[PDB]
Design a protein around this ligand. Sequence first.
Ligand code: NA
Ligand code: NA
Ligand code: NA
Ligand code: NA
Ligand code: NA
Ligand code: NA
Lengths: 297, 293, 111
Amino acid sequence: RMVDLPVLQPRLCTHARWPAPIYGLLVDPSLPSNPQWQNGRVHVDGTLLGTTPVSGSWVSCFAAEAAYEFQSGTGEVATFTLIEQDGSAYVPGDRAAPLGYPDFSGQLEIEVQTETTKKLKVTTFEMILGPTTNVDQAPYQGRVYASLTAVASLDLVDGRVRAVPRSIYGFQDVIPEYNDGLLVPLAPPIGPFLPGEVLLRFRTYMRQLDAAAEAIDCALPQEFISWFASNAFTVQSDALLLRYRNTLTGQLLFECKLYSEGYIALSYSGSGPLTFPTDGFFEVVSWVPRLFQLASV
Amino acid sequence: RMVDLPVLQPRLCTHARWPAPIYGLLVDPSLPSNPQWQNGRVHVDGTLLGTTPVSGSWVSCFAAEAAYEFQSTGEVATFTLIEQDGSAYVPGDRAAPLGYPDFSGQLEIEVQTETKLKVTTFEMILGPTDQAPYQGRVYASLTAASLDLVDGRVRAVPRSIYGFQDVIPEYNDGLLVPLAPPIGPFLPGEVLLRFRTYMRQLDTADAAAEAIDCALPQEFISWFASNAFTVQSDALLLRYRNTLTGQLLFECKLYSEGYIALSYSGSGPLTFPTDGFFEVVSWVPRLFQLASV
Amino acid sequence: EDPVTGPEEVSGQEQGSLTVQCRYTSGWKDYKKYWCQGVPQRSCKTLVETDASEQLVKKNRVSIRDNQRDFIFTVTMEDLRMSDAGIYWCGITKGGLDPMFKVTVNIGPVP
Ligand code: NA
Ligand code: NA
Ligand code: NA
Ligand code: NA
Ligand code: NA
Ligand code: NA
């Protein structure tokens, strides 16, 4: 059938790179124009790109076989043998990491369920993502290390874990250390854009430790990713002409191009950011060629 | 068009009552047969019931304007609830703001605070134990001297839970609130199909005891909410098939009110593979008798 | 008992030098030693690093020399300026989490 989009408002949708509600919708020409995000990447025909998962609950999380130890001067240390978050084995292949693994840098605070030999508890570990580390992180190989400050051993029992993100320290929107400094297969940078076209950004704010809010953007809501993955539409042209309309009235707010590679462009020539209402909805108009010139906003 | 379902495997879907992946699919006649869950509730025509949100990231979370205080009790937080998109919460035809927890126990919640920025864990009793999320007012506390916290807007996410019970929380100081009806009814011999995940409890020693069920994956909820299908009968006949082979594993009835029934007469739980997919077969009457599993 | 230790706090002055003694246990003798700057701890910027021998290495205004008899590698920061103040780390390079020890560097003016 012809491609369509759900009439869900952005403000009601799920962010695709950090597990939080979508709070903003904007273009910002001062930001990097071709980000190489690995989550939130899908083709219109349903092909998942990078480490993009189907479920929003996988976003910026991981699962692993955990082996614990105490080391004076470091604290409780965890060696994680990564698995896919459904429990299936992670196989190094044509993606950077297990599905949903964080695609940004900084010091990530993660939470896992632990147990001792000495009831179940939730323990917070520190895990460095990147950009570069002295920990030899290699999620592409299925190997990551984490630690937490402690005066003595926590007497943790080894076992399977799910790690959810609690906060981030020193956030940088650059890809993490996927393979101990070596190259990895990556989803390409978002783009290209026509002259005057800029990326449409779905924005949330992540919990941070270092007072201004810490924004992080993604190309599509997670609901749009599962929508395309579930529908497996036939792609007929380079892009789809979309109109973003108010949900209650139908008033047109802007027109944009959803390229088949899974990113939305607007024609905007301003210098600073331009935020849009988050209570509208996108409707598919038609297929257009790549060179289709949008009305400026 | 005729109702259809995405071919998504349950093990790849999002749980609708606790923010975690779906790990299990089962029936269990020893569990409460007609739960009154308020999240994970939708009609096949797309109507969201109870406090069910569109996004899985709202599930078992809330947002509020936070006012902090110290009582030599510890640090106390008074949360004036708002909807998680920032719009004002107005007491109406549901029990609480969308996504508010629909279970009981002492919930450990995490919010961003400022004294610069930190993440602080508060203790929040859901009850029944003076909580009134229906009125837009809930309280939390943390053992502590004053933390010198600055008041402001917060988003509270669940970290763990102490003393979990799958009964509705104290929505209105023990008084009644508008609720989505209990799940059901079922024919004789029919039992609820359960999509299961595991929450983080602090008083259980067995991970298998941390189970929490929902009626549908969150992806099915947004699927119905986005499609707005026309409902033609009491239920839909579904077949759960293996993804790789197509082999039929069981048939079930998706009642139009948003819950799936299987015909099962066993005493204990019966778990199913999570790497299958549901396909809509046809509309059936309420009295359509399923093949037993 | 810790794998690598040193001074918790050191103070230096404009155009002056300071010396950091990073002591380690004998097992780390043939490992590369390094001097790291900043936070986050595990993504800090390595300023200078040995080749697991006793030969002195100098980069910019920092030098390092490993004494593999007494199990101490000595870091010298020269021509100090106010921008040098901050958090640094004695480091030993190994697979996974490195032995690291936090050294806070205070820089003041010359009276
Ligand atoms: Na990634
Ligand atoms: Na990197
Ligand atoms: Na290392
Ligand atoms: Na308040
Ligand atoms: Na609720
Ligand atoms: Na050396």
